[PDB]
């Protein structure tokens, strides 16, 4: 299966550059055109250009040239972006897209890019456990809270992935800067106390992993 | 430039029903090799956008056969028939005729079902954040519908607001609901000076709160 390997989240001062790729498997890298788009907040789609991996024809939006560069990789199919002169306007997420002639085909997963000044700051995860709320006796809502955690990328995940129904895991709001992350896995009452509920918090750009639980 | 514009920005539809999106071109993007190169995008949230229609009347290999793009030179529109679940996201139009390329506004597919009370839940400050100098009041309201539905924070009676943060999860792909969570944010400091506090459920489905509450 054509698959495009377009990875990592991560963050840059402003005036910095930064060099994001993408790897063809699957098929032929040199057969279809790399194309780069930028969705802009998860909700604005812009075109950035193209680039051809067999002669290296390219092409660019006259509004993303003073700042794009792509690049091709033959040898280990990949195709690079390269954007620099990043102000807070650059943050946002970029794909890279396979396009034949006539159409784009399978776009890569994402990658997501804060331009930033600020400093990273792992999550505070706090365990919740009710004592207050709808009772423990049919079934619970369990919570974790993960707070003060600086860039925006933060996966919360249960029981070592061993409970994955149930579970409401919230997007995070910024507070002073700091992202607060809340999630929730309402679990039966024969869990919780008597098993263990384990929430696994992993936040890549401080390299920072916590498993927890409670009372 | 080309401008791509989306009507409706959001359109709310319930299950077995048909949808309607359109694309409008600010002109022709009918290609000289005689060719009209629109697209159909469905981007699922926390997802990146899948293709569904290219060239206005073709569809994917394995995209299910309810969608079905059709239009003239200038509009298009992407059609289907009895929404399913699995539609929630946003439908976006594409022009790859002239350049640069650009991407219709997009579309919000939310769907229409029948409304449910929240399953209301309080949480104290977790025993950490209290040895550490902080105090954070959680409140998840699960599975919901519609989504107007208000929360308020009060503390020993009286309604309280700064410090509160709500998120809002997606509508849910399976069943078609919201869950959100609010969370009063105070410092310990403020917090041992107070006994009770109520997450407040204000909604849309049974004009009655849902009320819960602890008091330490
Ligand atoms: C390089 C290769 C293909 C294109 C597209 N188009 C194909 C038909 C003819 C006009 C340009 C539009 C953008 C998405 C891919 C298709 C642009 C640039």
């Known amino acids: 299966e054509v698959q495009l390997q377009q990875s990592g989240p991560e963050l840059v001062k402003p005036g910095a550059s930064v060099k994001m790729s993408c790897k063809a498997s699957?098929?032929?890298?040199?057969?279809?055109?790399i194309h780069w788009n930028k969705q802009s907040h998860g909700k604005s789609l812009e075109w950035i250009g193209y680039?051809?991996?067999?002669?290296?024809?390219?092409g660019y939006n006259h509004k993303f040239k003073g700042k794009a560069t792509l690049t091709v990789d033959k040898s280990s199919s990949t195709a690079y972006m390269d954007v620099r002169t990043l102000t807070s306007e650059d943050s946002a997420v970029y794909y890279c897209?396979?396009?034949?002639?006539?159409?784009?085909?399978?776009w890569g997963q994402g990658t997501t890019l804060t331009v930033s000044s600020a400093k990273t700051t792992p999550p505070s995860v706090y365990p919740l456990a009710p004592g207050s709320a709808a009772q423990t006796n049919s079934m619970v809502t369990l919570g974790c809270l993960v707070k003060g955690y600086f860039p925006e990328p933060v996966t919360l995940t249960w029981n070592s992935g061993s409970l994955s129904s149930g579970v409401h895991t919230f997007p995070a709001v910024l507070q002073s800067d700091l992202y607060t992350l809340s999630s929730s896995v309402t679990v039966t009452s024969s869990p919780r106390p008597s098993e263990t509920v384990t929430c696994n918090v992993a936040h890549p750009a401080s390299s920072t992993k916590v498993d927890k639980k409670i009372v | 430039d080309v401008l791509m514009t989306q009507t409706p920005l959001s359109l709310p539809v319930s299950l077995g029903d048909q949808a309607s999106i359109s694309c409008r071109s600010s002109?022709?993007?009918?290609?000289?090799?005689?060719?009209?190169?629109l697209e159909w995008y469905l981007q699922k949230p926390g997802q990146s956008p899948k293709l569904l229609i290219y060239?206005?009347?073709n569809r994917f290999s394995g995209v299910p056969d309810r969608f079905s793009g059709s239009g003239s030179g200038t509009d298009f529109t992407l059609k289907i028939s009895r929404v399913e679940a699995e539609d929630l996201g946003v439908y976006y139009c594409?022009?790859?005729?002239?350049?640069?390329?650009?991407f219709g506004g997009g579309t919000k597919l939310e769907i229409k079902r029948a409304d449910a009370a929240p399953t209301v839940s309080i949480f104290p400050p977790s025993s950490e954040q209290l040895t550490s100098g902080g105090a954070s009041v959680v409140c998840f309201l699960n599975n919901f519908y519609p989504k107007d539905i208000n929360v308020k924070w009060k503390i020993d009676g009286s309604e309280r607001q700064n410090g509160v943060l709500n998120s809002w999860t997606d509508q849910d792909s399976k069943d078609s609901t919201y869950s959100m969570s609010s969370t009063l944010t105070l410092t310990k400091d403020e917090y041992e000076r107070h006994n009770s506090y109520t997450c407040e459920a204000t909604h849309k489905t049974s004009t009655s709160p849902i009320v819960k509450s602890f008091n330490r």
């Open positions: 897209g396979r396009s034949t002639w006539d159409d784009f085909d399978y």
């Open positions: 060239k206005v009347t």
């Open positions: 594409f022009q790859g005729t002239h350049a640069p390329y650009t």
């Open positions: 699957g098929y032929t890298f040199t057969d279809y055109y």
């Open positions: 002109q022709t993007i009918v290609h000289s090799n005689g060719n009209t190169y």
């Open positions: 680039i051809y991996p067999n002669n290296g024809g390219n």
